Design a binder for this molecule. Sequence first.
Ligand SMILES: Nc1ncnc2[nH]cnc12
Ligand SMILES: Nc1ncnc2[nH]cnc12
Lengths: 244, 246
Amino acid sequence: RPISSVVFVIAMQAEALPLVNKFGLSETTDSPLGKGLPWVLYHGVHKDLRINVVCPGRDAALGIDSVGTVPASLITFASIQALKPDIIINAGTCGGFKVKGANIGDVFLVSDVVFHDRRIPIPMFDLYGVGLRQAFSTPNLLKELNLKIGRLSTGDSLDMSTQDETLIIANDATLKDMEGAAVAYVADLLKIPVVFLKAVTDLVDGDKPTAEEFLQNLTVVTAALEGTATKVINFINGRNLSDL
Amino acid sequence: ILRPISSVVFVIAMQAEALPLVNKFGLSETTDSPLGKGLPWVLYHGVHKDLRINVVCPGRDAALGIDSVGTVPASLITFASIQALKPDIIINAGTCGGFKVKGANIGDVFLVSDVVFHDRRIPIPMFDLYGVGLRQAFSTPNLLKELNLKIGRLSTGDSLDMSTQDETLIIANDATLKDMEGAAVAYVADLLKIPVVFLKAVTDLVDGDKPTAEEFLQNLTVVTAALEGTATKVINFINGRNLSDL
Ligand SMILES: Nc1ncnc2[nH]cnc12
Ligand SMILES: Nc1ncnc2[nH]cnc12
């Protein structure tokens, strides 16, 4: 049987909105993931696919997107248990390494993902902290849409400490984000295939300030992210996991 | 109408930290997979006087076998445990690092005042405070006046070691204790409006002279016993009391 349900896990409202409009999704009103939660769930149906987009929502105290690994892991867990999707797509913005071939505006598919900020100097715990995990292989999607691909390194900091950099260079990542590896951890626990669409908003090895460049390109880059996400959804429609 | 506390959930990262407590109250490991269906999470249930006691652990990592420590698994089991078990209060009990300069000593079991993260650095307005994620533990003045436990702020991060960047932030946030799950458990407890208390037992001194991993593991067994003793006194104190009597 072909894929019939897809759940997008997106950290920022700014990243989700373009997709919500494109597919005419509606904000769920019956708090299916739990009562009193700030999480936002948009639902719709494109062709033969049920489409849901889940976001961690606004922090109650500050009012900004609840970015990071903890909220991403929670909404991934809750949405999987409630919706039982066939596949998860973690779509969002990220930092990229120019030396690795990444350019502003590129929307990457991810080969595998790791964490660069879970350092535990104990024999097996060390490999556990890194959490190397392969994304669901989608060779045909990659070929047909001609997307770039690379390894993603996740951490809860937007900046990059000296220690972070040493480890990121070591794991040879092309992309840097704040949720990916956590979404993969949860998808693994619940045995749900996960794919990533990461749009480069800033160059970590560039010259411009990370924060400034990120905010400056957010709008145009999330539009590009939607463009690719749309092509991905149309490609998945009618297909089975074996033909991606 | 408010009533006495009837259920308590202990969120414990390492099975080794939980076993002492499980054996103490003769809790049984639920084999019918209560919380989830197909997860490595371990749930021990039992009854002590007028309190239902649940102890949840992230369990063994399928790939490496060791305890699934860290903020992500802790947040997940806290979330799932709250929705399935509907506890009146959550107790995050476990080992931690302590700062000698802040008054911590090996073996001390601390009651946490508030908690923050030291490794979620987002150096921009508003997001910076979000990353720190300051949250206050549930107020238990009577418990503290009875057990006379030391108190202090807890700083959470997913690394057992301490980078130069981590250190600068921990010293700046004036934390007395350092762990790998606290702030995440508090984040989830706050989202679902469930009171949360922390019992953190010092296994190593971050500003001491011994290697962190070495001292941590060296004192793990003995300190976890001290943790059980305090956890037991806390359980017996809570019994018969309502949230306002804590
Ligand atoms: N440089 C970066 N690091 C982490 N997350 C990011 N999101 C966008 N740019 C990023
Ligand atoms: N120094 C330390 N840092 C983080 N978690 C710990 N658990 C025990 N000792 C610790």
